[PDB]
Amino acid sequence: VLSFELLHAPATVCGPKKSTNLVKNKCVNFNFNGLTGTGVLTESNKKFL
Amino acid sequence: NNCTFEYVSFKNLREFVFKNIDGYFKIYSKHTPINL
Amino acid sequence: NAQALNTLVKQLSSNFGAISSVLNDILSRLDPPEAEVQIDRLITGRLQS
Known part of the structure; x- marks a missing residue:
């Protein structure tokens, strides 16, 4: 028996x-973790921590 | 012990901020080599 | 002109008494009926801006 x-x-x-x-590269709709939007997706050079 | 939460993960200077921001407890930190 | 446009653009970040500054948040959190009151505040704010 597992308890939650x-x-x-x-x-x-x-x-x-x-x-x-x-x-x-295409124009697309997107949803990242609930972030709904519309745009073009590519790689990036961005140095995120 | 009425336990309620548990967690497990001089040239050196270590820096920290401890922030019990009412809504839950935040930690920030850094490490840097420095002069004496 | 830069001070005018970088105010006009930055006013998109303002809430105007809506639930968020970003319209996609409202549309992705609320069904159209309950959203319309929130969207009307953003319309009035962005329009007056």
């Missing part, structure tokens, strides 16, 4: 299910 509980502490076990694949 939810408290005020941040949950360390997390992660959504599989989603549709990626496309690049």
